[PDB]
Each structure stands twice: as structure tokens, then as C-alpha cells.
């Protein structure tokens, strides 16, 4: 009956009910426990969500820190991907991570991210803008994926044979491929946009 | 049928009053001055309401929904994102409302011109798609986070600084000074410069 069982069960519970239907009541039932006893481990539903975010990053965000003589591009690419994995790891995973601030045990890891990017050419400012851009892009991708995943079941089936040519092309494209390709292109796009600034390709 | 009515309008004001969590049948019915069965006739479920609220928000505040006479694809993507941003920021929990948006037939023509315009500028249809998507998802991601941390900060124990290290701290002050918008415009600019350079 420690903090770690509570969190493993919460994670199992998240998969079975999603975030809207996750409650301390249901978690206490899953555990065969009185609601009070659970309170000591999680005060309320947002503390719970913060803890679940933390577990997910900790289990599945394997490229949290830069690495080796890995380039800044490799890091940003590998960091985005790995983060996306964390957000996809559970039902409504992105929504759980949404609006979570890093704890102090995370502060150091954030520090050598910045330091790594500044040691490799970026101003602090641009390093922030770069990390910010990959992060918000990655989160928004997963957030919509997971949301449309849910919505499709709460809606009448789609009126597709009706769409004009290019939009219909797009739709068949999407159906064949899913979301990942879009994610990868947007990710490369960001990295490349920062390459061009850093490279002074378009200067005078 | 929503469009004939004031449900949307009132629901928006309510959304502001109480946020998306608080947008329940009981409170909407009340706000409107009508019992629940009449509201049910207007709207079967919350998703349906959110769909209509999203559209209504775009129709009020997303003014750069298509490319202008003479505009380059770079400027169109810039103005469209910025305009999208504004629409999402125009209401409480505004981005959450737009989450999982399914375009209706009424919107098909706008979407089609977007694609037609980008391909006319020499994107493949496929790469056009990725630029639109990247710009879209980034804009949405940015605002969702902006809005959530806006709410969550109030239920949260103020950044115990000094514990945090040198560059992190500098980054916190920077963000304290400048807010979200400069980071948003720089990120937008990257995406665009990314596609610009692949093009050639």
C-alpha cells in the first residue's frame, strides 16, 4: 500500500476509463480501499494527474537529456519523438501532461538541455524558443490524435463522398498513413527552420 | 437546430462564466430560462455543443481563414495561425473547445482553397498538408498549454526559485518578462522557414 502501487493502479485505471472518468472514488475501489486512506497518497484529482504525468515521462521519456556528441538536431528530434511516446503511452495521455510544471528532480535535466543547446550555438533565448516549439508542437499533435480518437465514437459516421478533390486526396492520404508522418515532417521542419537561422543562410 | 437560436451565443457567455467543466445541461438550461427537454431538442450531447461553439468562435474571431489577393503562402500561414490563435484565445478554455474539431461541409470550400492555393505555389499536395497540419497543431498546442497553466498556476505553489539552477532561472525571467507570444511567433517562423527551404 505505497505510493507506487497507487500510481500503477491509477495508470491501469486511466486506460480503462480515460481521464474524464478517472476519479479518486474509482481508484479506491480498484484498490479495495477506503477513500480517506487513498487521500494520503493523492490529495485530489489534479495531484493525481501530476503524479501520473511524472510516471509516464519517467517510464517512457527515455531521451529526456541530451547525449554523447549527439548533434543538437539529433537531440531535438530524438527528444520530441521520445516525448511523443510518453504522451501516447496511455489513454488521454496528452491531456494528463497538459499544464504540468516540472518538479525540482527534473530541474537539472532542463538545465543541461539549455546548456547543451547554448554550447552548440544557440543564444539562451533561441534555445528556449527551439525547445518550446518542439514541445508545444509534439503535445498539440498527440492532444488532437487522442481527442479525435474519442470523438469519432461520439459522432455519426463521416460525410466524405461530398468532399472536393484536394480535400478528398488529403483524406485518403490521412486514412492510409495516420498521424505519424505529419508529426515527423513538422518535427524536421522545426529543426530545419532553426538550422537556417543558426546558419545565417538568409542573412545580409 | 442551433443556428436558428440563441443557444450558441448564451453558451459562449456561460463558457466564460464557468469554463468548459461547468458547461453542464443544468446550467445551460437555466442560463437560457428553459427546462432541459427544450435544450435537448437544440443539442443532444456536449460534443455537439462544443462543435457548434468552436465553429461559432472561428466565425467570430478567425478572420484570416483564406489567402488574400497577392499574399504569399508564407504570409498566409503566418496570418492564418495568428488569426487561429486569436480565436482560440478569445474565450475561456477556448482551445479545449476546439480540440477534436471536425470540419463540416459548410467549411469544405475554405479548406479546398487553402490546399489549392498552396499547390498553386508549388507545394505537392502532400507537403502542403504537412505545413498546414504543422502550423495547425502547433498553434493549438501552444494555446491549450497557455490556457491550462493559466488555470493550474492558481492551484499551485508559486515557483520556489533559488532551488532552480542558473539558465533555467534566466529562462523563467525571460518568460516572466515576455510571455507566450514571442515564443509563439518564433516557432511559427521556424515551421515556415522549414518548409520554405525544403521547397527549394
Amino acid at each position: 500500500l505505497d505510493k507506487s502501487k497507487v500510481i500503477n493502479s491509477a495508470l491501469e485505471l486511466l486506460n480503462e476509463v480515460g481521464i474524464e472518468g478517472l476519479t479518486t472514488r474509482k481508484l479506491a475501489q480498484k484498490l479495495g480501499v477506503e477513500q480517506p486512506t487513498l487521500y494520503w497518497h493523492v490529495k485530489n484529482k489534479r495531484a493525481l494527474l501530476d503524479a501520473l504525468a511524472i510516471e509516464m515521462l519517467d517510464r517512457h521519456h527515455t531521451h529526456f537529456s541530451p547525449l554523447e556528441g549527439e548533434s543538437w538536431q539529433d537531440f531535438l528530434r530524438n527528444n520530441a519523438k521520445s516525448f511523443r511516446n510518453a504522451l501516447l503511452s496511455h489513454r488521454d495521455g496528452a491531456k494528463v501532461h497538459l499544464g504540468t510544471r516540472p518538479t525540482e528532480k527534473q530541474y537539472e535535466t532542463l538545465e543541461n538541455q539549455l546548456a547543451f543547446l547554448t554550447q552548440q550555438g544557440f543564444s539562451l533565448e533561441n534555445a528556449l524558443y527551439a525547445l518550446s516549439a518542439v514541445g508545444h508542437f509534439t503535445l498539440g499533435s498527440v492532444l488532437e490524435d487522442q481527442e479525435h480518437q474519442v470523438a469519432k465514437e461520439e459522432r455519426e459516421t463521416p460525410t466524405t463522398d461530398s468532399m472536393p478533390p484536394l480535400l478528398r486526396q488529403a483524406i485518403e492520404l490521412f486514412d492510409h498513413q495516420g498521424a505519424e508522418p505529419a508529426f515527423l515532417h513538422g518535427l524536421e521542419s522545426l529543426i530545419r527552420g532553426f538550422e537556417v537561422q543558426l546558419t545565417a543562410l538568409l542573412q545580409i | 437546430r442551433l443556428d436558428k437560436s440563441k443557444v450558441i451565443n448564451s453558451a459562449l457567455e456561460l463558457l466564460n462564466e464557468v469554463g468548459i467543466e461547468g458547461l453542464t445541461t443544468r446550467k445551460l438550461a437555466q442560463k437560457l430560462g428553459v427546462e432541459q427537454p427544450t435544450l435537448y431538442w437544440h443539442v443532444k450531447n456536449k460534443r455537439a455543443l462544443l462543435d457548434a461553439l468552436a465553429i461559432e468562435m472561428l466565425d467570430r474571431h478567425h478572420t484570416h481563414f483564406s489567402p488574400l489577393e497577392g499574399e504569399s503562402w508564407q504570409d498566409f500561414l503566418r496570418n492564418n495561425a495568428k488569426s487561429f490563435r486569436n480565436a482560440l484565445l478569445s474565450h475561456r478554455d477556448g482551445a479545449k473547445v476546439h480540440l477534436g474539431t471536425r470540419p463540416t461541409e459548410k467549411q469544405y470550400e475554405t479548406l479546398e482553397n487553402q490546399l489549392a492555393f498552396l499547390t498553386q505555389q508549388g507545394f505537392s499536395l502532400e507537403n502542403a498538408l504537412y505545413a498546414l497540419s504543422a502550423v495547425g497543431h502547433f498553434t493549438l498546442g501552444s494555446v491549450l498549454e497557455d490556457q491550462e497553466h493559466q488555470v493550474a498556476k492558481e492551484e499551485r505553489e508559486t515557483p520556489t526559485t533559488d532551488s532552480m539552477p542558473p539558465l533555467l532561472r534566466q529562462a523563467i525571467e525571460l518568460f516572466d518578462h515576455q510571455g507566450a507570444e514571442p515564443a509563439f511567433l518564433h516557432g511559427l517562423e521556424s515551421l515556415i522557414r522549414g518548409f520554405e527551404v525544403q521547397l527549394t
Partner: peptide
């Protein structure tokens, strides 16, 4: 992380 501006904001 997302490095959101308001992530270390103060009520």
C-alpha cells in the same frame, strides 16, 4: 517539457 511561458507563473 513544453517550456510554456506561464508554467512557472505566480497566482
Amino acid at each position: 517539457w513544453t517550456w510554456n511561458a506561464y508554467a512557472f507563473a505566480a497566482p
